[PDB]
RNA sequence: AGGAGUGGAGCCUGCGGCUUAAUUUGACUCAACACGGGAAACCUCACCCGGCCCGGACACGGACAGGAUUGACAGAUUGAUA
RNA sequence: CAGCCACCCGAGAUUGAGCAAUAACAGGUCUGUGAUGCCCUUAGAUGUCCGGGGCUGCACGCGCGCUACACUGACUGGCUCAGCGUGUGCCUACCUACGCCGGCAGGCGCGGGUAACCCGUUGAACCCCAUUCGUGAUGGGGGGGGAUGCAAUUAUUCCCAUGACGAGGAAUUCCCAGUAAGUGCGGGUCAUAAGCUUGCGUUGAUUAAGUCCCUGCCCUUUGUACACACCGCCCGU
């Protein structure tokens, strides 16, 4: 065969992009009248995931991958 | 999920990954006996195990 | 035992099959003797090359 | 426990042709001579010999632990399984390989082919074999592939 | 004028009560959910015929549903869908109706047109 | 003499379960010709029988000349 | 070489605790032979034994689907370099000459 | 001299141009067709997709270390299963 | 003389294969192989991950594969005979006695054994037919389903149906005594045989003890301006 010219359609990706501050500010949450941290996340029973994991708290779907609870805020 | 992300297939009836085993080649293999050699190393190594033609 | 071998991969050439023979050759022994005599007599280091097995059934 | 003897047979053929295209794959460089293997009551063992004695039985025992734990664990063998014994040389009845290893590093150092023939021949015949055959398949004069073949002595061919 | 019906029994009657009479009488490819195993891949196929059919507007062609390695088809009820089939280069357009039930649903996959009826090769006298 | 229904003729037959033994010509062939259906739904088999392709895998690759001259 | 690195220093930790080791190549398996009930990615293992044969530390071999490590005094060494692994440990490959 | 005496009739994996990307060759008239000892959706397609890992060690450039294959849930979504 | 024929004898007065020149073919195999003629080989995909359409698509178109093709025989069984093929595997898991539902499998403990132990005295094949078909294309080959594997599909792999051919396109096919064919038993894929193939039985034969014709190879003599050797060389417009 000949080469196609792959360039017609997606001659190659390129890696994920994603925008990330330097210090975490968007996995830790303020402002909750407490001169330290407070923890308004409800904590998950499951501990099989590591201890770095920031629960949140998302409108539609679950991204766990192990458990995947169902839920919704109404 | 997890099971079609990846390995949703298997072969239950390999024989290119069960193939000859001692060299790299799927032909020249035949199941009975335990053979995993081809026929050229099959006679490279016949009359060593004892094996004589007479016919 | 008989095995065939066909030699050129691909065809080309005659239908040598290359016949080889297997031909193993038994023989049996069963004994009522006592087991010292008979374990000194076999346990000589025994030839290479002779395959033997003692059973109890 | 009982195992019938054909199957076996063949088991014991896949072991062996494995074991010697892996030492014809590396001790060609170490001079050795004639290789076999022994069985003794649920033991396998494995023996070499050669001009080079103690060269082949190599320096440290790294060949020695390094090859049998290769066998030892590629082939389903319990640990210790395998041992090596000790022989000696009859006579000249068995003298190729000393002469032909003797040609090719030779020629690997940088040495005609044919010169090498002529020595590998006259050594030969000097040791008293009846007659040599050596075929270099390839390129040695020119881009046609002539597959050099030079005899000396008798050659049969028919009969048992 | 006439319609046609499997036994007597059309899609309503199909779709309404379930294949409890059709145990042991149910059909080959992967029946075997008693004598070998059970597999996947029925869950998010149901969840996305429940989305095809839940949102679709009436009077409109409905959400092509596209299979590359072709879905087994295990009840009609959803015949409703516009199904593209992966034939390689295009869309294999399918509109299923009550009549697809017993089927593999790539059967309805071809990508080559009949061998033209012109000449033979070069050397054809032999 | 107690014939079977998978051992009659016209067995589990499409759109009507019949097991009375009745032959009649002008619409038993008719019966016989369940294969309206199969044609119109244009499947795997009809697809192939538009053309006139065999479906028992007889190879007639270029052979056939029994009727094609 | 996209194996998380618990299991190259637990490869790397039996290696010198064993010796050599053998390997066997093959995507198709679920399960590794020797290091069964652990479900190990081969194509990863794979990877970086040929990134090791490359990075010039054991003598590169490929011998007819089954392969074996090459050992010296140079890949002993690198290995307990690599591993830090303590001044004091000697393989059992080695034992009473 | 004579028996099947084939092919004549629907009657092997391979098989000639073979329309489509494809039903192709690696063998070509005693040296191609039971050919690589194929009960063909595959390992019982080499010509086909895309998710499946992107083999770079060895002088060194990039914030002169965090640029996430590996984490699935009714709208995104060249299979929602990446 | 080497020898040859017949006869008397003898189990046998030539049984088959095995090994099989020197030298070469510009042969096959890197698709048995990471040494080897190689522009995309900067890891852009032939499989790693998917298996859809088909070498099952149609016209002389090269391929032994074509069982059977009818009163010699097709039916149903009264029936009576060695395969001496072989069939339970270190990371092996694929070979129904005792009782029954059944058209196959399906099984509930359950295929007796690592084998001359267990399949076994392996009742498989032309046969005294155990209803029918006394001369004709006919009784003569002859579209839904219940279930090995991830998926029966152009029925790959069981149940009822809607039964060309005349000894057959002109046809570089083998064969001379257990041999041609028939038929049968199996082994190669083994998730259960193989339309071929490889071994083995059974039934079992008519011409031959010769010759270069028409086919190939070989030898001797002879001619040659050929030696890359007649697919040569070579002359003229």
Redesign the pocket.
């Known amino acids: 065969?000949?080469?196609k010219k792959?360039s017609y359609?997606?001659?190659?990706?390129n890696?994920?992009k994603?925008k990330?501050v330097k210090l975490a500010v968007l996995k830790y949450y303020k402002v909750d009248e407490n001169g330290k941290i407070s923890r308004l996340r409800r904590e998950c029973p499951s501990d099989e995931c590591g201890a770095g994991v920031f629960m949140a708290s998302h409108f539609?779907?679950?991204?766990?991958?192990?458990?995947?609870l169902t839920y919704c805020f109404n | 999920?997890?099971q079609?992300?990846?390995?949703?297939?298997?072969?239950?009836?390999?024989?290119?990954?069960r193939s000859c085993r001692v060299?790299?080649?799927?032909?020249?293999?035949?199941?009975?006996?335990?053979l995993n050699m081809?026929?050229?190393?099959?006679r490279?190594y016949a009359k060593d195990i004892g094996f004589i033609?007479?016919? | 035992?008989?095995?065939?071998?066909?030699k050129?991969?691909?065809?080309?050439?005659?239908?040598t099959?290359d016949?080889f023979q297997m031909r193993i050759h038994?023989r049996l022994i069963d004994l009522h003797s006592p087991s010292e005599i008979v374990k000194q007599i076999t346990s000589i280091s025994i030839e290479p090359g002779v395959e033997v097995e003692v059973?109890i059934? | 426990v009982?195992?019938?003897?054909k199957?076996?047979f063949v088991?014991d053929g896949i072991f062996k042709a494995e074991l010697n295209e892996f030492l014809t794959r590396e001790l060609a460089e170490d001079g050795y001579s004639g290789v076999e293997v022994r069985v003794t009551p649920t033991r396998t063992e494995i023996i070499i010999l050669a001009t080079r004695t103690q060269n082949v039985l190599g320096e440290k025992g790294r060949r020695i632990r390094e090859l049998t734990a290769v066998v030892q664990k590629?082939?389903?063998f319990p640990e210790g399984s395998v041992e090596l014994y000790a022989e000696k040389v009859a006579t000249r009845g068995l003298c190729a390989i000393a002469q032909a290893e003797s040609l090719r590093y030779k020629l690997l150092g940088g040495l005609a082919v044919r010169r090498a023939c002529y020595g590998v021949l006259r050594f030969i015949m000097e040791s008293g074999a009846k007659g040599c055959e050596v075929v270099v398949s390839g390129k040695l004069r020119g881009?046609?592939?002539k597959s050099m073949?030079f005899?000396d002595g008798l050659?049969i061919?028919?009969?048992? | 004028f006439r319609k046609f019906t499997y036994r007597g029994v059309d899609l309503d009657q199909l779709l309404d009560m379930s294949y409890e009479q059709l145990m042991?009488?149910?059909?080959?490819?992967?029946?075997?959910r008693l004598?070998?195993?059970l597999?996947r891949?029925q869950?998010?196929?149901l969840?996305?015929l429940?989305?095809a059919k839940?949102?679709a507007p009436p009077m409109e062609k409905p959400?092509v549903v596209?299979?590359?390695?072709?879905?087994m088809i295990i009840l009609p009820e959803m015949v409703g869908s516009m199904v593209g089939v992966?034939?390689?280069?295009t869309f294999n357009q399918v509109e299923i109706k009550p009549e697809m039930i017993?089927h593999?649903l790539?059967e309805f996959?071809?990508?080559?047109?009949?061998?033209?009826?012109?000449?033979?090769?070069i050397?054809?006298?032999? | 003499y107690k014939i079977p229904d998978?051992?009659l003729?016209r067995?589990?037959d499409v759109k009507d379960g019949k097991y009375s033994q009745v032959l009649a010509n002008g619409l038993d062939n008719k019966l016989?010709e369940?294969?309206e259906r199969?044609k119109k739904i244009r499947a795997?088999?009809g697809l192939?029988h538009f053309?006139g392709?065999?479906?028992?895998?007889?190879?007639?690759?270029?052979?056939?000349?029994?009727?094609?001259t | 070489?996209?194996m998380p690195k618990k299991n190259r220093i637990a490869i790397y930790e039996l290696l010198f605790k064993e010796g050599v080791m053998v390997a066997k190549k093959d995507?198709?398996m679920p399960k590794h032979?020797?290091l069964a009930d652990k479900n190990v990615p081969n194509?990863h293992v794979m990877?970086a034994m040929?990134?090791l044969k490359?990075?010039?530390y054991v003598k590169?071999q490929?011998a007819?689907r089954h392969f074996y490590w090459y050992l010296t005094n140079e890949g002993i060494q690198y290995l307990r370099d690599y591993l830090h692994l303590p001044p004091e440990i000697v393989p059992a490959t080695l034992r009473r000459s």
């Open positions: 065969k000949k080469r792959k359609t997606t001659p190659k990706k890696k994920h994603r990330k539609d779907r679950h991204y766990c991958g192990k458990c995947c | 999920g997890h079609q992300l990846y390995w949703s297939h298997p072969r239950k009836f390999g024989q290119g990954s060299c790299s080649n799927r032909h020249g293999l035949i199941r009975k006996y335990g081809c026929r050229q190393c099959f490279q033609k007479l016919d | 035992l008989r095995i065939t071998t066909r050129t991969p691909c065809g080309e050439g005659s239908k099959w016949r038994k059973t059934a | 009982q195992i019938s003897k199957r076996k088991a590629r082939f389903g881009q046609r592939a073949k005899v050659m061919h028919s009969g048992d | 042991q009488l149910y059909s080959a490819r992967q029946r075997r004598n070998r195993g597999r891949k869950h998010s196929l969840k996305r429940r989305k839940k949102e959400e596209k299979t590359h390695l072709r879905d992966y034939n390689g280069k017993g593999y790539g996959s071809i990508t080559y047109k009949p061998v033209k009826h012109g000449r033979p090769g050397g054809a006298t032999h | 998978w051992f003729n067995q589990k016989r369940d294969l199969l795997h088999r192939r053309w392709l065999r479906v028992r895998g007889q190879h007639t690759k270029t052979t056939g000349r029994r009727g094609r | 070489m996209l995507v198709h032979p020797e194509l990877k040929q990134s490359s990075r010039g590169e490929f007819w």
